[PDB]
Curated annotation (Swiss-Prot):
Source species, domain of life: Eukaryota
Protein name, per record: TIR domain-containing adapter molecule 1
Domain annotation TIR: ranges: 8-160
Associated disease: Encephalopathy, acute, infection-induced, 6, herpes-specific: A rare complication of human herpesvirus 1 (HHV-1) infection, occurring in only a small minority of HHV-1 infected individuals. It is characterized by hemorrhagic necrosis of parts of the temporal and frontal lobes. Onset is over several days and involves fever, headache, seizures, stupor, and often coma, frequently with a fatal outcome.
Location within or outside the cell: Cytoplasmic vesicle, Autophagosome; Cytoplasm, Cytosol; Mitochondrion
Assembly with partners or alone: Homodimer. Found in a multi-helicase-TICAM1 complex at least composed of DHX36, DDX1, DDX21 and TICAM1; this complex exists in resting cells with or without poly(I:C) RNA ligand stimulation. Interacts (via TIR domain) with DDX21 (via C-terminus). Interacts (via TIR domain) with DHX36 (via C-terminus). Interacts with AZI2 and IRF7. Interacts with TICAM2 in TLR4 recruitment. Interaction with PIAS4 inhibits the TICAM1-induced NF-kappa-B, IRF and IFNB1 activation. Interacts with IKBKB and IKBKE. Interaction with SARM1 blocks TICAM1-dependent transcription factor activation. Interacts with TRAF3.
PTM description: Phosphorylated by TBK1. The phosphorylated pLxIS motif constitutes an IRF3-binding motif, leading to recruitment of the transcription factor IRF3 to induce type-I interferons and other cytokines.
Organism: Homo sapiens
Function: Involved in innate immunity against invading pathogens. Adapter used by TLR3, TLR4 (through TICAM2) and TLR5 to mediate NF-kappa-B and interferon-regulatory factor (IRF) activation, and to induce apoptosis. Ligand binding to these receptors results in TRIF recruitment through its TIR domain. Distinct protein-interaction motifs allow recruitment of the effector proteins TBK1, TRAF6 and RIPK1, which in turn, lead to the activation of transcription factors IRF3 and IRF7, NF-kappa-B and FADD respectively.
Entry remark concerning the domains of this protein: The pLxIS motif constitutes an IRF3-binding motif: following phosphorylation by TBK1, the phosphorylated pLxIS motif of TICAM1 recruits IRF3. IRF3 is then phosphorylated and activated by TBK1 to induce type-I interferons and other cytokines. The N-terminal region is essential for activation of the IFNB promoter activity.
From-to range in the entire protein, with total length: 387 to 545 of 712
Signal sequence coordinates: none
Tissue and organ distribution: Ubiquitously expressed but with higher levels in liver.
Length: 160
């Protein structure tokens, strides 16, 4: 539902638990301090019916530039992988970018707190940190400015 609402669009979906809000909210901005905008954050709540929050996970895959998986001890990575995956293997002819994932790691949580499989789960993506002095180059690497635009240039087509 929306009353003549303006054009809203994200560049990435920050997947995190429900107790990792401020965490994500802390990233969105931190992202705006490097380049990528606030974007958003996809959290699953058992309070709602389910499809009362967002469309789907594969939506941010075709909508958001790169999906950001908040790999936190409070959040579920395995699932994210499953979903994100299905989304990818679901519609490849679209973006066919199975490497558009961004496993973020906040200070609140850590990778060591994750299973030994996680390493293999993100054994290809670009581990994004929030306490790394390189993370800046990591985000500016994946979420480049020429991409954030060239990626939204497909949505702006509306205004263009």
């Amino acid at each position: 539902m929306e009353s003549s609402s303006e054009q809203k669009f994200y560049n990435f979906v920050i997947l995190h638990a429900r107790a990792d809000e401020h965490i994500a909210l802390r990233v969105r901005e931190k992202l705006e301090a490097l380049g990528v905008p606030d974007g958003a954050t996809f959290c699953e709540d058992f309070q709602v019916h389910g499809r009362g929050e967002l469309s789907c996970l594969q939506d941010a895959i075709d909508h958001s530039a790169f999906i950001i998986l908040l790999l936190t001890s409070n959040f579920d990575c395995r699932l994210s992988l499953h979903q994100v995956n299905q989304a990818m293997m679901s519609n490849l002819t679209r973006q066919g970018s199975p490497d558009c994932v961004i496993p973020f790691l906040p200070l609140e949580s850590s990778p060591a707190q994750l299973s030994s499989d996680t390493a293999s789960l993100l054994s290809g993506l670009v581990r994004l940190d929030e306490h790394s002095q390189i993370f800046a180059r990591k985000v500016a690497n994946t979420f480049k400015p020429h991409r954030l635009q060239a990626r939204k240039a497909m949505w702006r087509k509306e205004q263009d």
